[PDB]
Amino acid sequence: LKWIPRNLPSCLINVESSVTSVKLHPNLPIVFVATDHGKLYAFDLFNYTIPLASLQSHTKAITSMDVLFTNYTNSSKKNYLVIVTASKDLQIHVFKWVSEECKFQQIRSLLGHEHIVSAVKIWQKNNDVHIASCSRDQTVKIWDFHNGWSLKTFQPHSQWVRSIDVLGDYIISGSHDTTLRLTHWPSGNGLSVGTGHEFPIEKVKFIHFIEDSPEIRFRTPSTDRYKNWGMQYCVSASRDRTIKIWEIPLPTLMAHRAPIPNPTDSNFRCVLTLKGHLSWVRDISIRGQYLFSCADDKSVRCWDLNTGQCLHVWEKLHTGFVNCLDLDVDFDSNVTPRQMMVTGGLDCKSNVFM
Amino acid sequence: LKWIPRNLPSCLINVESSVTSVKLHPNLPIVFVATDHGKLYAFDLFNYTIPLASLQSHTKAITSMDVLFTNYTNSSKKNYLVIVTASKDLQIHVFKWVSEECKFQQIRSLLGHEHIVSAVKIWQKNNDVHIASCSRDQTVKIWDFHNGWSLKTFQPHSQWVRSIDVLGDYIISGSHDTTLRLTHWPSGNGLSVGTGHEFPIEKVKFIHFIEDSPEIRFRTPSTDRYKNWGMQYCVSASRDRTIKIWEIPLPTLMAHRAPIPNPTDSNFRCVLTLKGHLSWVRDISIRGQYLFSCADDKSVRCWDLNTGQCLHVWEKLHTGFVNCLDLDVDFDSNVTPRQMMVTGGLDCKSNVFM
Amino acid sequence: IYEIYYKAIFKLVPEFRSYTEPFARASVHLYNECKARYSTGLQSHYLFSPRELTRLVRGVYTAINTGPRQTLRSLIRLWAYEAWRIFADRLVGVKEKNSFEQLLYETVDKYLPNQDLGNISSTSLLFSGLLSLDFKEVNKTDLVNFIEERFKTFCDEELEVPMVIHESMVDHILRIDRALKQVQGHMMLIGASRTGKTILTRFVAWLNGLKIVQPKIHRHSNLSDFDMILKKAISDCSLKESRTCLIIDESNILETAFLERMNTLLANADIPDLFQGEEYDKLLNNLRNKTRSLGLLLDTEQELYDWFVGEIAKNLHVVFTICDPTNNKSSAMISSPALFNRCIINWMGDWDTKTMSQVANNMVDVVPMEFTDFIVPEVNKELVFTEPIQTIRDAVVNILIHFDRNFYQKMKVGVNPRSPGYFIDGLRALVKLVTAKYQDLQENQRFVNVGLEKLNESVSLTFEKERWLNTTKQFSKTSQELIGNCIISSIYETYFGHLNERERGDMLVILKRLLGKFAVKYDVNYRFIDYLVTLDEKMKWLECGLDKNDYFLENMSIVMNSQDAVPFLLDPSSHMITVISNYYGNKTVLLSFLEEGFVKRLENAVRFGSVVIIQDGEFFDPIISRLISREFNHAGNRVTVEIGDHEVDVSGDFKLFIHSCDPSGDIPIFLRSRVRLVHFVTNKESIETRIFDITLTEENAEMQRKREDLIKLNTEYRLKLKNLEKRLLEELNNSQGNMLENDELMVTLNNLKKEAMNIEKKLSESEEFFPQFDNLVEEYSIIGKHSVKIFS
């Protein structure tokens, strides 16, 4: 389908200060507004101003948030009941969502990163047992979600790590060194290195249930079926003022494990480069046929992933940096609820589109 | 939209002394409690009971609080960081509310009334160029809002002017002289004077977005196209132990510009008299179908505006006299959280109903 | 020649080719007009070289490379905006610039009269400082605000500074950005140090990610260490193939030989001996590996080394900053036309009064200058050249306009380059207090709010009402003069404690009668040296012998306990050697920050605890390194980024200031200008007092110390009243006139009946001792005054 989360803020949200990330609860039409207060707010998309939850606890600010979407029923059972966030206070804050439509209690507070934790991604692949995290320490860590343990640490980056994802048995991360690096969650064996940017990595993201992106760019580019079934896509928006559609199947961290190891461990693949505009991209939504991004320039953009053509620019949705978007995942039965985008930014506002 | 701001004190606000006026923030999940310390207290409607922003500046007692709400956008952008109060110590204070959810610093003292200032409103109507206020000195004053400059003074009431409203060009006021008044500010041409109370006026309120109220009761019996736009309605409750619904330009305080136009300076146009509770009325508030009022007998009544039938009584709001109540209005998209009545009184508390 | 330059341009934008030659002649005419009108005999910066015409074109031509289409107005916008961007910005004299604007204006009337001079030659507007040129423009005041927004992406232990970009400063910023675009964008910043300048070069380094290269050396070391730095810096340029950005403070020139190494670098992008012989060869080995990495044939030694200097050139962009050197280079280090015609020199110095209206504008917008019953603070005289003051922020604006204007001129301490970041430091001190003392005003009402929280219902008020009420209303009585006292402290924070009497007097003396015409109240004791220090603390200093008779040493009770920039603690007099070591006394030295850094000769000497400055006689070269001049301000390389605080963890009490005994001590020039010069001008009262101290050994020296202890003794009873407020917190709301029906009354004020007497006890003892001690010191003035004359 063509997802059209447009119209014009069905709900205008005036926030105490700025917003860093707004994402939808796995099952309910409520979102969690991650602010710089650091307060996490529970928010029914069809109501305002909601005092349901003003979860002050992120001592400094909310830098990361995950588990608001789920891909596996037995873990889902707890995922709709939990969330993993992280702050500038070096803690990875794991909470328990309850039937009250909010994170009633805290489950875990993880510490080991010393310079600011920049991003956390949960190993849903491990039934919500392992947690991937990264930070300004140039370091990537694995934690035990259900026990609060530091399970495994890796050193990939040369610079302060900016973003993170989970894919295969390896941990995806991007940083200020402009290079993406991916190491094996159990050993350090790599699954990607990307020297595909001039400037630092700002946003990474694995393809989901949307073969439309493969229809547009079948990958791998060399023998797609080599790993078409294993399409471990990723993307990497960066300070190049681009949104590059990436791939870890053939810029794999095989450190020349033959001579030129296929074409892995080099100048990163770059499936499709969406040349951006005059500012830095803050968020994206890989729709499949389309991509919905936003940037410091106050704009939200509809991109046609068929060559990466910005179909429409909405520079007036915010009056400050657009910090975040959340066009809810493809999912029939809730097409209108999924064709709904929430956003937040520098201007202390947040908006609900559809 | 319908509403149920009932149940029982969902939040019990704890103030060191008596509560005098409570102002819900229109867009944030917080509430401002004016007291007789004179101390304002922001309270967090989720994280309660917490005195989010205890504010000291008034040496005697705070009688009024405004600027959380507005009539002009560009100035309101600048005034969302502003809160304006009135006081028994003659202080009408302008507070620069800071994004930290606290009135960090005052930016203008508003002086002029030599006697207890019991109400202040701001003429946001002129691109927020002016300020309305009234007091025990039988006088109404206008300040240049942007500079705090007493630009216009009026003589309306013969007694303590208890309350004042902003109607663009007109000034609603009530007082101890049992005679409800209104003034055409641009010329100082009284637009009302109605001696309809037996006992001293305690509380008045300008008709807002409730033109369905005319379908319930309306004077003169017909023809709202004559001048409803100039025949500004209000409610005036008093020590009569009744609540009177009013139209006050029918009994205009004008220098009889023909004979007596309508009942100008004559038979006071009390639209509807309510009788239920047993004492001097301290507050009123029209939600639309219903009017929630309070009195010295501690009994709040959800008056069905349609002829005046109390739906429900809240003798349980406070153990002291109920000084005020604050109905949050439901609007499309922003509906469920608006099911709320925050009250306050002599028992030093401010209870939140929902 | 320039007809060729411009007819080329009008083949590129032939739609308005009709300008061609007269356009070229407008360029050359204005040039010769200004060359003749402003010769080098006026000043060297009026050296109108024919390559200034090429420079003029560089802005014009590179703009048409971005331009979408030309119009005659766009064309003259480009040219005449560029003309003052080049031909006027390259100059200093403002009246010469006014005539320039008219020479420009008239030049257009002479050759290109058809276009809009009114909105172009007469105003310093910028071509979209944050967008691609394209003959597009953006309001530069708005650009300042847009920068505020945009630098939030660099607001991370990088910028984060409470200072304002002057609208002339943003003109300077864009010019800097242009210089950054320039290959080998070498610069020379002339003017106010570390105040929208040195700070600004750091800003653009943070905003653009530029490698500030520093000469991390010491006078003990020599050119050899510079050579090392140059080897690793040039390795970054040519071997790592990365863009560097050498930042030079004129005090970095170790020696002429070093400068000569630099001169050849400037001439041939290389350094003799340093990158010759084996260094040449090892570079060729590394370089060919880098051109091999590039897949190029440049490996060939000659091409390789040419690549070395070519890669370097792309990666140099040396930004030099400067305050007039005393080594004859006050006439510019760039004495030669060879450097003059190649280095981008910013003749800034000071800023306009009009500019100060905009500086102050934003400076009063960024911080909460407004108050309650405070109406306005200026009584003296002068709202001239400005708008009549309607409120407090307006006052600061008017003040700044005439204040910075004359604070400072009168050539004693460099009449042409004043530093507004000091008025910002003064204002920043006003901000420290506009917040803190304002908050104290809320706390003040809170003091009586709290008292009120349990009056009526639980009191039998005597003194408590007197105190409660008097202070309750004194909060409004003090509604003017609080600022007046604060202003004076900011004057001293601005320049009284740094700038010499005449350069200072330019505003200071006249400020006493020319602050403005709109309220304030000064309040007799508005004295800076008392205003910012707690009496208990001041006594900790006086009890330790503080030379209070020297105004600027009495000041140390504040500065040592609250000083941002290093104070010049000159001690041949050993006034503060005596006092600092006494104040220190039983206190421990330095400790929070604990890592030894790079200067263990000092860190081993100071890392123990509470009080310390770089101690008695510890002169720069022997103790303080140039590494410290950097790390002193901040140091995330030792205070790990893991903490998050990249500033070195050093408090004021143990902040490493220097007890130099050399009046012309080795303070790095920017720090020499950014220093609280502490004056040890042993005042006549200090002369006779030090002599008193000698003569006090006759019998009663200890009496001096005893009274100071006793002054502090008087402060013991603040809690006899403050505890009442604490004990008057809860029962007001039960006030029914039954205050005598319970012991909530007596539990607080029956105690006061005796606590009030306690207030009198040790307090009065101190006072009984006071005159007794005074009579044992003053008696030596019979010869103390003689020693004053003897000292003269």
**Residue of A115, A278, A346 lying closest to C641 (CB–CB):** A115
Cα(A16)–Cα(C445) distance, integer angstroms: 27
Q: What is the 8-class DSSP label of residue B126? A: G
Cα(C148)–Cα(A161) distance, integer angstroms: 26
The answer, for B29 touching chain A at a CB cutoff of 8 Å, is: yes
The answer, for B222 touching chain A at a CB cutoff of 8 Å, is: no
Residues 6+ apart with CB under 8 A from C202: C212
**Residue of A10, A53, A348 lying closest to B333 (CB–CB):** A10
The answer, for C761 touching chain A at a CB cutoff of 8 Å, is: no
Q: Among B234, B213, B203, B230, which residue's Cα sits nearest to residue B296?
A: B203
Residue of chain B whose Cα is closest to the Cα of A9: B333
Q: Among C561, C556, C532, which residue's Cα sits nearest to residue C677?
A: C556
Q: Is the CB of residue C423 less than 8 Å from the CB of residue C511?
A: no
Q: Among B91, B161, B76, which residue's Cα sits nearest to residue B122?
A: B76
Q: How was this structure determined?
A: cryo-EM
Whether the CA torsion C530, C531, C535, C538 is positive or negative: it is negative
Q: Which two tokens stand for residue C49?
A: 């070289």
Residue of chain B whose Cα is closest to the Cα of A56: B47
Residues 6+ apart with CB under 8 A from C759: C717, C720, C721
Chain C residue numbers with beta carbons less than 8 Å from the beta carbon of A137 are 642
Residue with tokens 């200008």: C673
DSSP strand pairing (A170-175 vs A180-184): antiparallel
Other C-beta atoms lying within 10 Å of the C-beta of residue A127: 13
Residue type, C204: V
Residues 6+ apart with CB under 8 A from C459: C465, C728, C739, C745, C748, C749
Torsion of CA C598, C604, C610, C611, to 10 degrees: -90
The answer, for C214 touching chain B at a CB cutoff of 8 Å, is: no
Peptide-bond breaks in chain C following residues (C–N over 2.5 A): none
**Residue of C149, C150, C642 lying closest to A115 (CB–CB):** C642
Residues 6+ apart with CB under 8 A from A307: A272
Q: How many CA atoms lie within 13 A of C495 on its CB side?
A: 26
Q: Give B77's strand partners.
A: none
Cα(C614)–Cα(B181) distance, integer angstroms: 74
Q: Is the CB of residue B177 less than 8 Å from the CB of residue B197?
A: no
Cα(B289)–Cα(B353) distance, integer angstroms: 18
CB within 8 Å: B99 and A16 = yes
Shortest CA gap A176–chain B (Å) = 31
Q: Is the CB of residue C21 less than 8 Å from the CB of residue C112?
A: no
Q: Is the CB of residue B242 less than 8 Å from the CB of residue B251?
A: no
Cα(C700)–Cα(C186) distance, integer angstroms: 66
Cα(C67)–Cα(C131) distance, integer angstroms: 12
DSSP strand pairing (B322-328 vs B270-274): unpaired
Residues 6+ apart with CB under 8 A from B31: B13, B22, B23, B24, B25, B42, B43, B45, B326, B342, B350, B352
Residue C653: what are its φ and ψ, rounded to 5°? Answer: -60, -35
Q: Is the CB of residue C359 less than 8 Å from the CB of residue C402?
A: no
3-state secondary structure of B245: strand
Whether the CA torsion A59, A64, A70, A72 is positive or negative: it is negative
Q: What is the 8-class DSSP label of residue B329? A: P
3-state secondary structure of B28: coil
Residues 6+ apart with CB under 8 A from C656: C590, C602, C606, C612, C613, C614, C628, C632, C650
Chain A residue numbers with beta carbons less than 8 Å from the beta carbon of C131 are 278
Could you give the angle at which helices C223-238 and C301-314 cross, rounded to 10 degrees?
100
Q: Which two tokens stand for residue A49?
A: 């101003």
Chain C residue numbers with beta carbons less than 8 Å from the beta carbon of B151 are none
Cα(B147)–Cα(C168) distance, integer angstroms: 29
**Polymer length of chain A:** 354
Residue with tokens 């009431």: B157
C714-720 contacts at long range (C-beta below 8 A, 24 or more positions apart): C714/C762, C714/C763, C714/C766, C714/C767, C715/C535, C715/C536, C716/C762, C716/C763, C717/C755, C717/C758, C717/C759, C717/C762, C717/C763, C720/C752, C720/C755, C720/C756, C720/C758, C720/C759
**Residue of B37, B96, B109 lying closest to C449 (CB–CB):** B37
CB within 8 Å: B337 and A50 = yes
Cα(C124)–Cα(C97) distance, integer angstroms: 12
Cα(C348)–Cα(C89) distance, integer angstroms: 8
Q: Among C722, C768, C784, which residue's Cα sits nearest to residue C748?
A: C722
Q: Which two tokens stand for residue C270?
A: 């290389």
DSSP strand pairing (C319-322 vs C187-191): parallel
| CB neighbour burial string for C708-736, b if at least 16 within 10 angstroms, e if fewer | bebbbbbeebeebbeebbebbeebbbbbe
HEC per residue, chain A: CCCCCCCCCCEEEECCCCEEEEEECCCCCEEEEEECCCEEEEEECCCCCCCCEEEECCCCCEEEEECCCCCCHHHHHHHCCEEEEEECCCCEEEEEEECCCEEEEEEEEECCCCCCEEEEEEEHHHCCCEEEEEECCCCEEEEECCCCEEEEEECCCCCCEEEEEEECCEEEEEECCCCEEEEECCCCCEEEEECCCCCCEEEECCCCCCCHHHHHCCCCCCCHHHCCCCCCEEEEEECCCEEEEEECCCCCCCCCCCCCCCCCCECCCCCEEEECCCCCEEECCECCCEEEEEECCCCEEEEECCCCEEEEECCCCCCCCEEEEEECCCCCCCHHHHCCEEEEECCCEEEEEC
Q: Is the CB of residue B194 less than 8 Å from the CB of residue B268?
A: yes
Which among C134, C153, C154 is the top mutation candidate for probing chain A, defined by the most A β-carbons within 10 Å of its own β-carbon? C153
Burial class (CB in 10 A: 0-12, 13-18, 19+), C229: middle
Chain B residue numbers with beta carbons less than 8 Å from the beta carbon of C472 are 59
CB within 8 Å: C641 and A136 = yes
Name chain A's partners: 3 or more CB pairs within 8 A: B, C
Q: Is the CB of residue B155 less than 8 Å from the CB of residue B137?
A: no
Residue of chain C whose Cα is closest to the Cα of B55: C442
Angle at A57 between CA C639 and CA A72, to 5 degrees: 105
Q: Among C329, C385, C327, C321, which residue's Cα sits nearest to residue C348?
A: C321
Cα(C103)–Cα(C105) distance, integer angstroms: 5
Q: Is the CB of residue B76 less than 8 Å from the CB of residue B124?
A: yes
The answer, for B342 touching chain A at a CB cutoff of 8 Å, is: no
Helix residue ranges, H only, C626-718: 626-631, 669-673, 684-695, 702-713
Residue type, A335: V
3-state secondary structure of C186: coil
Name chain B's partners: 3 or more CB pairs within 8 A: A, C
Cα(C224)–Cα(B171) distance, integer angstroms: 83
CB within 8 Å: B334 and A56 = no
| Alpha carbon separation from C495 to A138, C500, C678 (Å, rounded) | 45, 8, 11
Q: Is the CB of residue C99 less than 8 Å from the CB of residue C93?
A: no
Check residue C332 and give left, alpha or beta (phi > 0: left; psi -120 to 50: alpha).
left
Q: Among C298, C173, C175, C311, which residue's Cα sits nearest to residue C243?
A: C311
Burial class (CB in 10 A: 0-12, 13-18, 19+), A121: buried
Cα(A257)–Cα(A252) distance, integer angstroms: 11
Residues 6+ apart with CB under 8 A from B171: B132, B134, B140, B154, B156, B164, B165, B182, B183, B184, B185
Residue type, A48: Y
Cα(A150)–Cα(A111) distance, integer angstroms: 8
The answer, for C336 touching chain B at a CB cutoff of 8 Å, is: no
CA C196 remoteness from chain centre: 8
Rg over CA atoms, chain B: 19
CB within 8 Å: C641 and A296 = no
CB within 8 Å: A47 and B101 = no
Q: Give C379's strand partners.
A: C516
Q: Which two tokens stand for residue A223?
A: 């023998």
Q: What is the 8-class DSSP label of residue C389? A: P
Residue C482: what are its φ and ψ, rounded to 5°? Answer: -55, -45
Cα(A112)–Cα(C693) distance, integer angstroms: 59
Cα(C465)–Cα(C461) distance, integer angstroms: 5
List C residues 143-172 in contact with A (Cβ-Cβ < 8 A): 149-150, 152-153
Cα(A79)–Cα(A70) distance, integer angstroms: 7
Chain B residue numbers with beta carbons less than 8 Å from the beta carbon of C475 are 59
Residue type, C447: F
Residues 6+ apart with CB under 8 A from C62: C133
DSSP strand pairing (C244-249 vs C211-213): parallel
Cα(A95)–Cα(A104) distance, integer angstroms: 7
CB within 8 Å: B333 and A54 = no
Shortest CA gap B147–chain A (Å) = 27
CB within 8 Å: B56 and C472 = no
Shortest CA gap B212–chain C (Å) = 42
Residues 6+ apart with CB under 8 A from C264: C270, C271, C272
Residue with tokens 């070395």: C308
Q: Among C632, C430, C499, which residue's Cα sits nearest to residue C192?
A: C499
Residue of chain B whose Cα is closest to the Cα of C450: B37
Cα(A326)–Cα(A300) distance, integer angstroms: 11
DSSP run (H or E) holding B182: strand B180-184
Name chain C's partners: 3 or more CB pairs within 8 A: A, B
Shortest CA gap A114–chain C (Å) = 5
Chain B residue numbers with beta carbons less than 8 Å from the beta carbon of A46 are 333, 335-336
Q: Is the CB of residue B173 less than 8 Å from the CB of residue B164?
A: yes
Chain C residue numbers with beta carbons less than 8 Å from the beta carbon of B348 are 733
List binding-site positions of C for ATP.
191-198
CB within 8 Å: A56 and B47 = yes
Strand order in the sheet with A180-184: A161-167, A170-175, A180-184, A190-194
- Report whether the peptide linkage leading into residue C185 is cis, meaning its omega lies within 30 degrees of zero: no
Chain C residue numbers with beta carbons less than 8 Å from the beta carbon of A88 are 644
Cα(A200)–Cα(C773) distance, integer angstroms: 70
| Alpha carbon separation from C35 to C22, C38, C100, C152 (Å, rounded) | 18, 5, 11, 44
Burial class (CB in 10 A: 0-12, 13-18, 19+), A164: buried
Q: How many CA atoms lie within 13 A of A301 on its CB side?
A: 28
Cα(A292)–Cα(A322) distance, integer angstroms: 12
**Declared resolution, Å:** 10.5
Angle at C79 between CA C75 and CA C83, to 5 degrees: 165
CB within 8 Å: C452 and B37 = yes
**Residue of A10, A14, A46 lying closest to B27 (CB–CB):** A14
Cα(B127)–Cα(A306) distance, integer angstroms: 48
Rg over CA atoms, chain A: 19
Q: How many CA atoms lie within 13 A of A67 on its CB side?
A: 30
Which among C432, C444, C445, C457 is the top mutation candidate for probing chain B, defined by the most B β-carbons within 10 Å of its own β-carbon? C445
Q: Among A227, A294, A234, which residue's Cα sits nearest to residue A270?
A: A234
CB within 8 Å: B334 and A11 = yes
CB within 8 Å: A296 and C131 = no
Helix residue ranges, H only, chain B: 73-79, 213-216
Shortest CA gap C338–chain A (Å) = 36
Cα(C179)–Cα(C319) distance, integer angstroms: 9
Rg over CA atoms, chain C: 32
**Residue of B26, B80, B333 lying closest to A46 (CB–CB):** B333
Q: Is the CB of residue B180 less than 8 Å from the CB of residue B201?
A: yes
DSSP strand pairing (C567-568 vs C676-677): parallel
DSSP strand pairing (B53-56 vs B102-110): unpaired
Residue with tokens 């510009």: B257
Q: Which two tokens stand for residue C1?
A: 């020649």
- Report whether the peptide linkage leading into residue B63 is cis, meaning its omega lies within 30 degrees of zero: no
Q: Among A196, A195, A246, A247, which residue's Cα sits nearest to residue A226?
A: A247
* N-terminal to C-terminal alpha carbon distance within chain C: 68
Cα(B51)–Cα(B47) distance, integer angstroms: 10
Residues 6+ apart with CB under 8 A from C446: B56
Chain A residue numbers with beta carbons less than 8 Å from the beta carbon of B80 are 14
Chain C residue numbers with beta carbons less than 8 Å from the beta carbon of B39 are 449
CB within 8 Å: A14 and B29 = no
HEC per residue, C398-466: HHHHHHHHCCCCCCCCCCCCCCCHHHHHHHHHHHHHHHHHHHHHHHHHHHHHHHHCCCHHHCCCCHHHH
Cα(C169)–Cα(C182) distance, integer angstroms: 20
Q: Is the CB of residue A296 less than 8 Å from the CB of residue A310?
A: no
Residue C689: what are its φ and ψ, rounded to 5°? Answer: -70, -40
**Polymer length of chain C:** 792
Residues 6+ apart with CB under 8 A from A150: A110, A112, A141, A142, A143, A144
DSSP strand pairing (C244-249 vs B180-184): unpaired
Cα(B3)–Cα(A242) distance, integer angstroms: 49
DSSP strand pairing (B170-175 vs B180-184): antiparallel
CB within 8 Å: A49 and B99 = no
Residues 6+ apart with CB under 8 A from A181: A156, A157, A173, A175, A190, A192, A193, A194, A253
Cα(B343)–Cα(B350) distance, integer angstroms: 5
B108-112 contacts at long range (C-beta below 8 A, 24 or more positions apart): B108/B148, B108/C370, B108/C372, B109/B148, B109/C371, B109/C372, B109/C373, B110/B84, B110/B143, B110/B148, B111/B150, B111/C373, B112/B141, B112/B143, B112/B150, B112/B153
Residue A260: what are its φ and ψ, rounded to 5°? Answer: -95, 105
